[PDB]
UniProtKB/Swiss-Prot annotation:
<comment type="subunit">
    <text>(Microbial infection) Interacts (via its SH3 domain) with hepatitis E virus/HEV protein ORF3.</text>
</comment>
<protein>
    <recommendedName>
        <fullName>Tyrosine-protein kinase Fyn</fullName>
    </recommendedName>
</protein>
<comment type="function">
    <text>Non-receptor tyrosine-protein kinase that plays a role in many biological processes including regulation of cell growth and survival, cell adhesion, integrin-mediated signaling, cytoskeletal remodeling, cell motility, immune response and axon guidance. Inactive FYN is phosphorylated on its C-terminal tail within the catalytic domain. Following activation by PKA, the protein subsequently associates with PTK2/FAK1, allowing PTK2/FAK1 phosphorylation, activation and targeting to focal adhesions.</text>
</comment>
<comment type="similarity">
    <text>Belongs to the protein kinase superfamily. Tyr protein kinase family. SRC subfamily.</text>
</comment>
<feature type="domain" description="SH3">
    <location>
        <begin position="1"/>
        <end position="59"/>
    </location>
</feature>
<comment type="subunit">
    <text>Interacts (via its SH3 domain) with PIK3R1 and PRMT8. Interacts with FYB1, PAG1, and SH2D1A. Interacts with CD79A (tyrosine-phosphorylated form); the interaction increases FYN activity. Interacts (via SH2 domain) with CSF1R (tyrosine phosphorylated). Interacts with TOM1L1 (phosphorylated form). Interacts with KDR (tyrosine phosphorylated). Interacts (via SH3 domain) with KLHL2 (via N-terminus). Interacts with SH2D1A and SLAMF1. Interacts with ITCH; the interaction phosphorylates ITCH and negatively regulates its activity. Interacts with FASLG. Interacts with RUNX3. Interacts with KIT.</text>
</comment>
């Protein structure tokens, strides 16, 4: 924790971004770039950039 949940599906298109689906949860490893955050998915066990407007905090 702190854990975020994916609100929508996202398909990667660059080299550092991560593909994910509605409902995957993430550990945010690095959140200092406003729009793009470094995450690890607790579902697929994978690491890469995700867009921040595509996740919400878990609660």
């Amino acid at each position: 924790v702190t854990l975020f949940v994916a609100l929508y599906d996202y398909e990667a298109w660059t080299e550092d971004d991560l593909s994910f689906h509605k409902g995957e949860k993430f550990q945010i490893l690095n959140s200092s770039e406003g729009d793009w955050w470094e995450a690890r998915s607790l579902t697929t066990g994978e690491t890469g950039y995700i867009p921040s407007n595509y996740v919400a905090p878990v609660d």
